[PDB]
Write a protein that binds this ligand. Structure first.
Ligand SMILES: [Cl-]
Ligand SMILES: [Cl-]
Ligand SMILES: [Cl-]
Ligand code: NA
Length: 129
């Protein structure tokens, strides 16, 4: 599914991501924009042979099982495929674990490089939240 910007902001808010670990909703929308362009089916193969899945490009090295990332963990206790669903529940629940792991949203390189320090409220401007 390709979400609209406000559509995704709504879904994220309903699943409790807004201000989670102190990160306002626009941080999460900005991260999704640059990670996946709001497409839940996004995948990206990394140099190390791990893969990133879904709206927030969550990685198989630590967070989900794909059966093809030797040595990895599955800390969200899900198949990576769950992260490609039209329903973002799995992705949000897992993101909450990631953002709690010590580095906040710096876990998402793209957030650090493209969202951090920017006017992230723009990503929710106009949404009926
Ligand atoms: Cl915001
Ligand atoms: Cl594996
Ligand atoms: Cl933090
Ligand atoms: Na894994």
């Amino acid at each position: 599914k390709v979400f609209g910007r406000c559509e995704l902001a709504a879904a994220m808010k309903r699943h409790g991501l807004d201000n989670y670990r102190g990160y306002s909703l626009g941080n999460w929308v900005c991260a999704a924009k640059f990670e996946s362009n709001f497409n839940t089916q996004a995948t990206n193969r990394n140099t190390d042979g791990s893969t990133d899945y879904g709206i927030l490009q969550i990685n198989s090295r630590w967070w989900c099982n794909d059966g093809r990332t030797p040595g990895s963990r599955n800390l969200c206790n899900i198949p990576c495929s769950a992260l490609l669903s039209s329903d973002i529940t799995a992705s949000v629940n897992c993101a909450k674990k990631i953002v709690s792991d010590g580095n906040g949203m710096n876990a998402w390189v793209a957030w650090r490089n493209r969202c951090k320090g920017t006017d992230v409220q723009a990503w929710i401007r106009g949404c009926r939240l």
